[PDB]
Design a protein around this nucleic acid. Structure first.
Ligand SMILES: [Mg+2]
Ligand SMILES: [Mg+2]
Ligand SMILES: [Mg+2]
Ligand SMILES: [Mg+2]
Ligand SMILES: [Mg+2]
Ligand SMILES: [Mg+2]
Ligand SMILES: [Mg+2]
Ligand SMILES: [Mg+2]
Ligand SMILES: [Mg+2]
Ligand SMILES: [Mg+2]
Ligand SMILES: [Mg+2]
Ligand SMILES: [Mg+2]
Ligand SMILES: [Mg+2]
Ligand SMILES: [Mg+2]
Ligand SMILES: [Mg+2]
Ligand SMILES: [Mg+2]
Ligand SMILES: [Mg+2]
Ligand SMILES: [Mg+2]
Ligand SMILES: [Mg+2]
Ligand SMILES: [Mg+2]
Ligand SMILES: [Mg+2]
Ligand SMILES: [Mg+2]
Ligand SMILES: [Mg+2]
Ligand SMILES: [Mg+2]
Ligand SMILES: [Mg+2]
Ligand SMILES: [Mg+2]
Ligand SMILES: [Mg+2]
Ligand SMILES: [Mg+2]
Ligand SMILES: [Mg+2]
Ligand SMILES: [Mg+2]
Ligand SMILES: [Mg+2]
Ligand SMILES: [Mg+2]
Ligand SMILES: [Mg+2]
Ligand SMILES: [Mg+2]
Ligand SMILES: [Mg+2]
Ligand SMILES: [Mg+2]
Ligand SMILES: [Mg+2]
Ligand SMILES: [Mg+2]
Ligand SMILES: [Mg+2]
Ligand SMILES: [Mg+2]
Ligand SMILES: [Mg+2]
Ligand SMILES: [Mg+2]
Ligand SMILES: [Mg+2]
Ligand SMILES: [Mg+2]
Ligand SMILES: [Mg+2]
Ligand SMILES: [Mg+2]
Ligand SMILES: [Mg+2]
Ligand SMILES: [Mg+2]
Ligand SMILES: [Mg+2]
Ligand SMILES: [Mg+2]
Ligand SMILES: [Mg+2]
Ligand SMILES: [Mg+2]
Ligand SMILES: [Mg+2]
Ligand SMILES: [Mg+2]
Ligand SMILES: [Mg+2]
Ligand SMILES: [Mg+2]
Ligand SMILES: [Mg+2]
Ligand SMILES: [Mg+2]
Ligand SMILES: [Mg+2]
Ligand SMILES: [Mg+2]
Ligand SMILES: [Mg+2]
Ligand SMILES: [Mg+2]
Ligand SMILES: [Mg+2]
Ligand SMILES: [Mg+2]
Ligand SMILES: [Mg+2]
Ligand SMILES: [Mg+2]
Lengths: 80, 121, 82, 157, 205, 129
RNA sequence: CCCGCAGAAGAAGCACCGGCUAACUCCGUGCCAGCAGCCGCGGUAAUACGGAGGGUGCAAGCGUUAAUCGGAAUUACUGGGCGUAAAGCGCACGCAGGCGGUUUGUUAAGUCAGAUGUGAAAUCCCCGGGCUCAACCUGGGAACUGCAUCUGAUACUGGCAA
RNA sequence: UAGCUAGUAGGUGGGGUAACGGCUCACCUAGGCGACGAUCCCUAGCUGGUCUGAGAGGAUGACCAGCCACACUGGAACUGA
């Protein structure tokens, strides 16, 4: 299948582009404790489809600006 | 302690300073020498200890101990310096290498002659 | 251009040649794709002297890789029916 | 079954109106070389009088140690005062790789090969009690089988 | 490379007979053995735990004629090899050519066996060998070459080997100076006096 | 405030053994019963119940062989401040394999000895010497 | 590399020696001259200083030096502490953050299990082999505790349920 | 060192590039980054490995091998795959 990544939106106030955080629950190399680490990506989308505070699926694709190589696939669970 | 505290601020290793700032991990270093003189040590000893201020090549100004009975150092005369505290003269933390350069060997030594820079009899 | 050639390993006056598939531009000892047997000129008549994996040679020479002066003769030395 | 030996001898002072009077303390550990150990302290005015006084206490103050062939059963701690003491079973090769005081007690006990390290303070008296605490503590598979009332093979295998 | 000093001085310090000054006569009684290491031989040594290890190490060194740097290398090899570390230390020492040449009887002393190896006399599997440290593998045939065979130093030295215990692991022809090293030596076969355990203690710390 | 319930269970056992106490009541749970069963099945605890409908109180009954207690020592490994998940080959063996390590694996809670043979790893809950 | 020449012939130091740490005495000197890695040695009977012998330890190297790790559980994840030894903020409230009682259902992020990829070759590690032997050299093996990728296991932890 | 950033962050019109794209214009939107440490400051080639350690680690990056960078200093483009 296509190698997508789930993630919650941080902001969408840029016209046809969305910044999305990807929470990843990796463990600490030394101390062994599980940390909640973040990965803020820039992502493309046609129109202002997705708002602030909602889960989104994202695909790796062609680099369509300075940053912002990732692109939207679909929305799952809209904003509250 | 507390595994979360350590994630937030890890264990800082104690960066222990070097005893001998001769710099760049150097075995020995040349010195032009100024003021050769006699100094008294700390409490239980009592003596007239032979010592000289060493103007090192890199820029430092230190005191080095003149180990052995008698010496040829005076006013100037270029000498070589090795690491090693005397543990009596407070301040002095280097040793002159006897034999090398203008610093000659000790006169009439037999036992232990690499220390104190003397050839075979 | 990929080429099958010796690598020259081992001590002074005691060479040992790792026949190897490498690029033309890269060095003798340096980069390669995969080593393919060896050669020892100071072996003499004993158990082992020279070994050369002929199956991997078909993958490279069949495609488009040259064989050097020394390695071409070791294919003659190992023979097809002798 | 003697296998007695001395760990440490240490002179100690009292202080009285006249001046100071010195005595000596011994520290001897004895064992049969087959699962009995016993430290004895003892103290006397003269040095050789102390070691006899120590050895006599050591013989009486003996502890049994259930050990496998010529080694320990399982890795074992044994704290006492300021000495931590850890020691591991180890295999049929090797020897007693442990510190002095901690290895006098081990060799006369009859353990032929173990790993061992004295953490904390390494006071010869307290490390010897630290080991013997750990060796007394050390339970065998026959003890553990009977304690739970299951089976010697079902636990082990 | 070698000791080349007073050799029977080494036996008095160590106490026991080291087979350094063994030679033609059987027993010496010619040094005040045991009670005269040096000027201060009557001084009873207190002798610590590090002492007894180092006295044991130097004894095994001075018997076999090996130096600390080479002797340490045997320990490193011994630790990596299978079995027991102590048994391998001495099994490697006994496999030396100058030691096997001594055990065959081609040399009254081990220094004579070392020199006889070094002097192009000793030959094994049809190949001449000069190295005293040569590790003699199982199933071999050490021998003397035809030029140096039946010279005056070897014939007198072979008659000494009849008084000796004679190892079970190796065999000697005696007529044509031809030896045969068969198996590796076992602990129980040789010595029964020099302790290995204490020499394993010295190098593990 | 009562963050780890499982560690609290293992203290009531350890402290109950120290007092030479016969029984040990506590608030029950799914995982409490799973662990307490694994302890019973090998033979540290001698029987247990889960008496109650609305507010269930799981009580254990601690074993004693001599004057000494049966549980020599017992400690939480995978506490909530630091979870410890071990792989099949990397599973521990407590006391060189004569004490057990309770380990929550994907086919229910079980001993480390059972987890090796079953062919899977998991969250190591406690060591029981 | 293989044979012939001669004749022990051309070929041994240098640390150390009060304890730690394998190894003793005589002189000279007298808190002076000097040793000192740590403790510490000398004030007229120095085992520590200088000399000598005597020893001990290494030896084609030996000491000193600088440099890293070790011992140091003396930054402690494995593996330390905080009443009096260094160390509980003067005491509260509290957002972010860390952690969270108990019971079913569902996802599988964590976790676990297998899957294929791949971790360049070298060294490092075993079974071998060629240097007269080793050192070196080299053939194969595992190792390369990797990181990704589909498939499941759902106890535990998280997500979402009521 | 706690705030930094105006081709700065996007979108399109044009433009270039072997090719994706503020790589470069013209406009349009006024954002983007940062306590999961931006910015600034000091130091530094990176890795396979090496060294030490029981191992975790700590140190390290001479020698062989891969990658990057640089060529009297600072620019610039040409010629060609
Ligand atoms: Mg994935
Ligand atoms: Mg993972
Ligand atoms: Mg770009
Ligand atoms: Mg002296
Ligand atoms: Mg040829
Ligand atoms: Mg030919
Ligand atoms: Mg060509
Ligand atoms: Mg008095
Ligand atoms: Mg301490
Ligand atoms: Mg040598
Ligand atoms: Mg002594
Ligand atoms: Mg052989
Ligand atoms: Mg002749
Ligand atoms: Mg070691
Ligand atoms: Mg697994
Ligand atoms: Mg002739
Ligand atoms: Mg001749
Ligand atoms: Mg001393
Ligand atoms: Mg003493
Ligand atoms: Mg001594
Ligand atoms: Mg006299
Ligand atoms: Mg000295
Ligand atoms: Mg006298
Ligand atoms: Mg005197
Ligand atoms: Mg001498
Ligand atoms: Mg040396
Ligand atoms: Mg140093
Ligand atoms: Mg350290
Ligand atoms: Mg440490
Ligand atoms: Mg800790
Ligand atoms: Mg502390
Ligand atoms: Mg105070
Ligand atoms: Mg305080
Ligand atoms: Mg308070
Ligand atoms: Mg108050
Ligand atoms: Mg919160
Ligand atoms: Mg819960
Ligand atoms: Mg459920
Ligand atoms: Mg359903
Ligand atoms: Mg499912
Ligand atoms: Mg695979
Ligand atoms: Mg494959
Ligand atoms: Mg592979
Ligand atoms: Mg190496
Ligand atoms: Mg090599
Ligand atoms: Mg080999
Ligand atoms: Mg040769
Ligand atoms: Mg290979
Ligand atoms: Mg290889
Ligand atoms: Mg291969
Ligand atoms: Mg295979
Ligand atoms: Mg293979
Ligand atoms: Mg590799
Ligand atoms: Mg599915
Ligand atoms: Mg279900
Ligand atoms: Mg939460
Ligand atoms: Mg939530
Ligand atoms: Mg505006
Ligand atoms: Mg190591
Ligand atoms: Mg360590
Ligand atoms: Mg290593
Ligand atoms: Mg270079
Ligand atoms: Mg590379
Ligand atoms: Mg240049
Ligand atoms: Mg140029
Ligand atoms: Mg230029």
């Amino acid at each position: 299948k296509i190698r997508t990544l789930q993630g919650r939106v941080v902001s969408d106030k840029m016209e046809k582009s969305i910044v999305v955080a990807i929470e990843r629950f990796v463990k600490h190399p030394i101390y062994g404790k599980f940390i909640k680490r973040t990965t803020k990506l820039h992502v493309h989308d046609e129109n202002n489809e997705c708002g602030i505070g909602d889960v989104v699926e994202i695909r790796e694709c062609r680099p369509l600006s300075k940053t912002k190589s990732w692109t939207l696939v679909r929305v799952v669970e809209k904003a509250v | 302690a507390t595994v979360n505290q350590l994630v937030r601020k890890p264990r800082a290793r104690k960066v222990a300073k070097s005893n001998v700032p001769a710099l760049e991990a150097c075995p020995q270093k040349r010195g032009v020498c100024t003021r050769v003189y006699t100094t008294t040590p700390k409490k239980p000893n009592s003596a007239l200890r032979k010592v000289c201020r060493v103007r090192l090549t890199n820029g430092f100004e230190v005191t080095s101990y003149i180990g052995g009975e008698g010496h040829n150092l005076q006013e100037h005369s270029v000498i070589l310096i090795r690491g090693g505290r005397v543990k009596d003269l407070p301040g002095v933390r280097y040793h002159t290498v006897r034999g090398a350069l203008d610093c000659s060997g000790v006169k009439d030594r037999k036992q232990a002659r690499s220390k104190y820079g003397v050839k075979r009899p | 251009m990929v080429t099958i050639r010796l690598a020259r390993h081992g001590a002074k006056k005691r060479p040992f040649y790792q026949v190897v598939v490498a690029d033309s531009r890269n060095a003798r000892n340096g980069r390669f794709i995969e080593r393919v047997g060896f050669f020892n000129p100071i072996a003499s008549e004993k158990e082992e002297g020279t070994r050369l994996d002929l199956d991997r040679i078909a993958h490279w020479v069949g495609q488009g890789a040259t064989i050097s002066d020394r390695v071409a003769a070791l294919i003659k030395e190992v023979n097809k029916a002798a | 079954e003697l296998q007695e030996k001395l760990i440490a001898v240490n002179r100690v002072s009292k202080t009285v109106k006249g001046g100071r009077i010195f005595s000596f303390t011994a520290l001897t550990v004895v064992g049969d070389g087959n699962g009995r150990v016993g430290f004895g302290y003892g103290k006397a005015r003269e040095v050789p009088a102390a070691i006899q006084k120590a050895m006599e206490k050591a013989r009486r103050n003996m502890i049994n140690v259930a050990l496998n062939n010529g080694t320990l059963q399982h890795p074992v701690k044994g704290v006492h005062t300021g000495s931590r003491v850890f020691m591991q079973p180890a295999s049929e090769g090797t020897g007693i790789i442990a510190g002095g005081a901690m290895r006098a007690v081990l060799e006369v006990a009859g353990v032929h090969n173990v790993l061992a390290k004295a953490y904390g303070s390494t006071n010869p008296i307290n490390v010897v009690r630290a080991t013997i605490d750990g060796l007394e503590n050390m339970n065998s598979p026959e003890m553990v089988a009977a304690k739970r009332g299951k089976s010697v093979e079902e636990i082990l295998g | 490379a070698r000791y080349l000093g007073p050799k029977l001085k080494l036996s008095r310090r160590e106490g026991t007979d080291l087979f350094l000054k063994s030679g033609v006569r059987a027993i010496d009684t010619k040094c005040k053995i045991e009670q005269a290491p040096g000027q201060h031989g009557a001084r009873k040594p207190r002798l610590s735990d590090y002492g007894v290890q180092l006295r044991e190490k130097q004894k095994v060194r001075r018997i076999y004629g090996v130096l600390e740097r080479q002797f340490r290398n045997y320990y490193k090899e011994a630790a990596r090899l299978k079995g027991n570390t102590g048994e391998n230390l001495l099994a490697l020492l006994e496999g030396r050519l100058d030691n096997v040449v001594y055990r065959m009887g081609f040399g009254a002393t081990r220094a004579e066996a070392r020199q006889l190896v070094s002097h192009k006399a000793i030959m094994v599997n049809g190949r001449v060998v000069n190295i005293a440290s040569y590790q003699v593998s199982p199933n071999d045939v050490v021998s003397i070459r035809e030029k140096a065979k039946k010279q005056s130093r070897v014939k007198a030295a072979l008659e000494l080997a009849e008084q000796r215990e004679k190892p079970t692991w190796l065999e000697v022809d005696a007529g044509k100076m031809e030896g045969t090293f068969k198996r590796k030596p076992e602990r129980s076969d040789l010595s029964a006096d020099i302790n290995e355990h204490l020499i394993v203690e010295l190098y593990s710390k | 405030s009562m963050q780890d319930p499982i560690a609290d269970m293992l203290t009531r056992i350890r402290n109950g053994q120290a007092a030479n106490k016969a029984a040990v009541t506590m608030p029950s749970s799914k995982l409490k019963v799973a662990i307490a069963n694994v302890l019973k099945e090998e033979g540290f605890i001698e029987d247990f119940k889960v008496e109650g409908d609305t507010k269930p109180e799981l009580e254990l009954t601690l074993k004693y062989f001599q004057g000494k207690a049966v549980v020599e020592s017992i400690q939480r490994v995978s506490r909530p401040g630091l979870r410890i998940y071990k792989r099949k080959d990397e599973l521990p063996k407590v006391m060189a394999g004569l004490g057990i390590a309770v380990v929550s694996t994907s086919k229910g809670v079980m001993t480390d000895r059972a987890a090796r043979q079953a062919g899977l790893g998991g969250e190591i809950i406690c060591y029981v010497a």
